[PDB]
Design a protein around this ligand. Structure first.
Ligand SMILES: OC[C@H]1O[C@H](Sc2cccc(F)c2)[C@H](O)[C@@H](n2cc(-c3cc(F)c(F)c(F)c3)nn2)[C@H]1O
Length: 138
């Protein structure tokens, strides 16, 4: 496969029990990946692996409102690897997005944007070959 940046419409927005699954392969020498769950121009949940931020690998999560980024949430568990296939699962729970990578729980992100049914697209960008992006209800 899919052309990146890729937009996945989320019809009717997100809801608890919605599971988003992304399969792809990290490019060689990758620098960054981003998932953006968007409410119009706002970013309800930005999930941003950085492969070299001051020679550290970190995942940064945040929300963008009226073009302003908020407080970053950082996770040093870093399950992505240059050149290698991955699976990202994002499960919407009532109070957070819950993210697992390669079947291992990674992080949770508390809902700051509370109008879940207005979060109706997911952007996928950065240094990946994107194989598939889909959703289902569990
Ligand atoms: O806080 C989160 C943000 O941090 C900074 S801005 C900032 C600085 C200090 C404190 C703070 F709160 C915010 C970044 O520049 C922000 N970013 C990253 C990408 C982006 C685009 C792409 F096309 C990709 F492919 C990609 F992987 C990432 N767009 N925007 C975002 O990550």
């Amino acid at each position: 496969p899919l052309i990146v940046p890729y937009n996945l419409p989320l019809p009717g927005g997100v809801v608890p029990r919605m599971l988003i699954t992304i399969l792809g392969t990290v490019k060689p020498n990758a620098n960054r990946i981003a998932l953006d769950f968007q409410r119009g121009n706002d970013v309800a949940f930005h999930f941003n692996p950085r492969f070299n931020e001051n020679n550290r690998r970190v995942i940064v999560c945040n929300t963008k409102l009226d073009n302003n980024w908020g407080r970053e949430e950082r996770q040093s568990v870093f399950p992505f690897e240059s050149g290698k296939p991955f699976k990202i699962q994002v499960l919407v729970e009532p109070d957070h997005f819950k993210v697992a990578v390669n079947d291992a729980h990674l992080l949770q992100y508390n809902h700051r944007v509370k109008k879940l049914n207005e979060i109706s697209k997911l952007g996928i960008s950065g240094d990946i070959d994107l194989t598939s992006a889909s959703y289902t209800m569990i």
